[PDB]
Design goal:
2 copies of one chain form a homodimer.
Chain A lengths: L16 E2 L1 E7 L10 E7 L5 E6 L2 E8 L5 E3 L6 E7 L4 E7 L2 E7 L7 H11 L5 E4 L2
Antiparallel strand pairs in A: 1-3, 2-9, 2-10, 3-4, 4-5, 5-6, 6-7, 7-8, 8-9
PDB class: transport protein
Keywords: lipocalin, transport protein
Assembly: dimeric
Amino acid sequence: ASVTQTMKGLDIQKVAGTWYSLAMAASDISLLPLRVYVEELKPTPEGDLEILLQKAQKKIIAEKTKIPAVFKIALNENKVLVLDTDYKKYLLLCMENSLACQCLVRTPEVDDEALEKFDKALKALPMHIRLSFN
Amino acid sequence: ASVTQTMKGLDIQKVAGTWYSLAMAASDISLLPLRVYVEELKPTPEGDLEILLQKAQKKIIAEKTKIPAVFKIALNENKVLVLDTDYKKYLLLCMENSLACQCLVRTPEVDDEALEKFDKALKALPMHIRLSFN
């Protein structure tokens, strides 16, 4: 991917709280290890991102970098990419080794803005597998 | 490996402090990503192990398990295995995906107990690559 595809002007503090994985996509079929469900984001006062996820709860710390929408997690290098969020409804997030992207929503209310924007974002990226849940 | 090859009666509190990587060995040549140098161990009051290492300093948290010499780190599952230590001189430590083992010493004093015991421990395990440093 490119820095061109990451989000401009992210405020990491406003993504705090609960999220639900509506859908996932990945560059390689076997990737879906990156089959992980973001349940909560907890930014730190220092600007790092704690990720609570389901696989068993895992707690991951993605550290800030010089790119405000890109965090570094480990022995195996993984980056967390925030593609886009409105903070109140949806967050598009990618984890790179190579690439898995998740469509996160604040609540599973009947509304399809998040999934339209996920699908629009994936058009640019070479994905070989796509999942959507109930 | 087996639980039979992990250490009996580990006190994680006594491995606290500085260590030096004298030597590494691994199951697969390409493994030496697990080319990481343990510089410090910091056990927590809760019994988890913080690992400071050189690759750039990385800080890894290996959580306790029901096995007192085995800690769990992440998206990719890695276990840290303490094979053997006398706490004061040497620690034999393995990181599993599959397997890399390190010979750690408290100080680079002229003494070869650590390396004899590393080599004796590796006899049992299928290693294809071995490194030793100055």
